[PDB]
């Protein structure tokens, strides 16, 4: 990885552009006005990118002879960053603050600051933008896994009376659904954040490297099947296929398929008659996990409980809600977004049934159908000197109020409430509204303030 | 990276869940019934992730390790992995045959075959099903892409009567947009096989390192402004900002954002009154780009285009339509996507403006809204040996025909017409329809044929 090829290529250029005689840029990011934003995977980024030796020789002739072609042209600053990698041994020379990681933080507020330390260095500020940017992508995924978590334990409650078992209720099925190895990794550490079921493994490794926990691991699955391993068999034999797997499983939670051919008669004939003797007898700390596939996911899930609460013994429970055995639940992994897991929670309590009884998968909805516009994350330079003297900066767009930014030094405050203020033009000075709660977390190549997942985790919690 | 842990967590269960007796395991990867697909970056994927020796005695401890604790039970394949190993020096028994990269195919039609060359690794086919299955990735961003270069080719060859300057229509600006560094090379990769213009400098180490072009480097850009470049010189002295960059950029095309506070003064009074000569004076070579970056995207093109069109010169083309003098373009890079660019280029034609005025930035658009299901990928297993005998599976959920996957042994082929037809059933070895187009590109930790990306270009390329 070379950091003077991971820019966009216009801030190649941009040294060029700024007043004379600027000695700062100071940038900030936020999620420009989902009321509340999980701040989460700037650490991933300070260490595996931006910290340390990140400058040296070889690095910067590769850029230079990768834009002298890519722009057809000399406009590469290879005088700044020889500065860089003579002065400083390559580090860069860059202050960051930020709140703390699993924070929960109302839109339009700082989230971060960046500036130069170095006055030669006006230009690093924005040439980092692009790769501290992506942190749309963690605090996004973190983000919207958590609204889901709502959803599932307000329900939850609603049908149960309790939140057990709900950092189990949606389960990571994305890990071919995204976009990159990379990708995986840092999405599924993201929904990690909130649950702890999950299939993406690549997030296990990422956080036990850059955020760390107490346990062994931070997520956890079960065995579960695939249609490769029932139609396998051959169409005929779904019931040895079933058979099989539950056999091999007798002992902890197991997760079969079972719509590949018609999960309606799945579910009642081959679940419910022909091997109904191999369900009963298992351990409420071993169920079968019973999961549909296709079709309309809600009108799904409501026919697949109904059959089962006609070939099993139903409870009812404290709050007068439809209750399983304990050896027997379903998962619902087709389909699922943060819309459709609420229609299909809603309609389960309409026809009285727990929300104990299901859990829900999600792949592409929970790793990839999302973009940096959904929280409107944006980066923008919002203070400069220039010839000594502090300007305060912004822009401020005739036709979107939307894209109008923030003016001069930024800070992060509670107010007398309690509740969240940023302040512009340095006015945090003032102490009217107490300390900033931005921390530095990198400065001049170090990573100077740092957080386990288990703070994080903590941080992120929801106010139930 | 360790392959072992590169997987769905469920797929580490999967080998105890087949038949017994299996000897083969086979699948296959469709964009299963945006009618065409560009087949590109399978070959990313195999030299990055699958080729050499994969297992090493360390990675079989760290699976087994991180897998008791995932799963609170020791349900690895250690026998399995260390097999392979010991066996074949840790390269993986599978062979692979794909369709050619850069082939361009309607949906339906199998684009790969997966299988297992050793009895013993059954249950590998199915293991890099996920690794293989993000191809939908660069397969998307590509044909996505591809798209868009349609509508810009034929509002083009309308409005002028030919397409020069197309390949440089269409900018990648998604590197701050996308989830991971990673995807950045992936996805610019991806748009780099239909266009030359991109600012997500990513793009071009990965076509170097996997793929290989004649040209120095596949894609290019120009020097541009951002706000922070114009902003910092104070809101009173966006006439300064504008004019220090386009003297400092005199003699190359240069981009510069002019929105921060007013587009159309920007437009009407800034360069059409303050700067024009500084504008007027440019080379054909080197024009003024124009960039507007807020507002709707349809409205504000045009308005930008009227006010220009009365402060500039304008010849009307041999078409009818409008053309500003050569040293002045507008390039609209805010809310682009597929959509949008089909809505701008019409309503430009509608008010007989020529498409040689206009190119388009796009980032989210063209690299992160994109999942999975826009091409409906997806991997299935087709054909098995059980008992030496080979069986034709496949899944057909009753309430969605849609997942109905192919059977059996599958082959891809040109029709007497010159359209192509996937074959079922090993029916391909009937000989009727001329030869498979599937070739084998990985066999045994090999990579076996590969493309350079100047044939995938060739194969990608518009039909006119
Ligand atoms: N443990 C599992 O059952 C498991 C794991 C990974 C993916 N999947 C598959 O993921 C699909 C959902 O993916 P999307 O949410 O990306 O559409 C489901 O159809 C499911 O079959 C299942
Ligand atoms: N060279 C450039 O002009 C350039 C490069 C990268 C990103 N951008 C910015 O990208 C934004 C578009 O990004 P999205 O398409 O992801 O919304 C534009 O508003 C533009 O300012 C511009
Ligand atoms: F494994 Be099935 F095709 F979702
Ligand atoms: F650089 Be601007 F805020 F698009
Ligand atoms: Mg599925
Ligand atoms: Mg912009
Ligand atoms: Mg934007
Ligand atoms: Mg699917």
Redesign the pocket.
């Known amino acids: 990885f070379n950091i003077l090829l991971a820019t966009?290529?216009?801030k190649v250029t941009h040294y060029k552009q700024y007043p004379p005689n600027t000695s700062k840029v100071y940038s900030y990011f936020e999620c420009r006005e989902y009321e509340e934003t999980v701040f989460y995977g700037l650490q991933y980024i300070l260490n595996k990118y931006l910290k340390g030796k990140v400058v040296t020789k070889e690095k910067i002739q590769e850029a230079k002879d990768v834009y002298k072609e890519h722009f057809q042209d000399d406009v590469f600053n290879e005088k700044g960053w020889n500065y860089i990698l003579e002065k400083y041994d390559g580090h860069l020379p860059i202050e960051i603050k930020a709140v703390p990681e699993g924070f929960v933080i109302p839109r339009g507020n700082v989230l971060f600051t960046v500036e130069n330390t170095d006055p030669e260095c006006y230009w690093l500020t924005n040439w980092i933008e692009t790769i501290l940017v992506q942190s749309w992508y963690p605090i996004t995924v973190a983000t919207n896994s958590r609204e889901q978590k709502k959803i599932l334990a307000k329900y939850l409650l609603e049908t149960s009376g309790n939140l057990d078992g709900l950092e189990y209720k949606l389960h990571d099925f994305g890990y071919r659904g995204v976009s990159s190895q990379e990708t995986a990794g840092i999405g599924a550490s993201a929904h990690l954040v909130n649950f702890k079921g999950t299939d993406t493994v690549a997030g296990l490794a990422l956080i036990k490297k850059y955020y760390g926990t107490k346990d062994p691991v931070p997520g956890y699955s079960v065995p579960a099947a695939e249609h490769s391993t029932i139609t396998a068999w051959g169409k005929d034999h779904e019931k040895d296929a079933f058979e099989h797997i539950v056999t091999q499983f007798s002992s902890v939670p197991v997760s079969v398929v079972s719509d590949s051919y018609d999960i309606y008669n799945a579910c009642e004939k081959i679940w419910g008659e022909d091997l109904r003797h191999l369900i009963v007898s298992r351990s409420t700390q071993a169920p079968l996990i019973i999961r549909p596939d296709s079709g309309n996911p809600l009108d799904t899930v409501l026919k697949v409980l109904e059959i089962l609460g006609k070939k099993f013994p139903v409870t009812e429970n404290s709050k007068g809600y439809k209750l399983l055995p304990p050896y027997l639940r379903v998962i619902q992994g087709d389909g699922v977004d943060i819309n459709t897991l609420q229609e299909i929670v809603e309609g389960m309590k309409q026809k009285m049934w727990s929300i104990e009884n299901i859990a829900f998968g999600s792949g592409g909805g929970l790793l990839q159908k999302l973009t940096?516009?959904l929280l409107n994350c944006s980066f923008k330079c919002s203070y400069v000197v220039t010839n000594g003297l502090g300007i305060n900066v912004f822009k401020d767009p005739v036709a979107d109020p939307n894209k109008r930014s923030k003016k001069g030094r930024l800070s992060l405050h509670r107010t007398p409430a309690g509740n969240f203020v940023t302040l512009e033009e340095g006015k945090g000075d003032l102490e009217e509204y107490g300390q900033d709660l931005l921390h530095t977390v990198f400065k001049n190549g170090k990573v100077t303030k740092s957080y386990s997942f288990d703070e994080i985790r903590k941080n992120a919690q929801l106010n139930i």
Chains 1, 2 share one sequence.
């Open positions: 966009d290529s216009y940096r516009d």
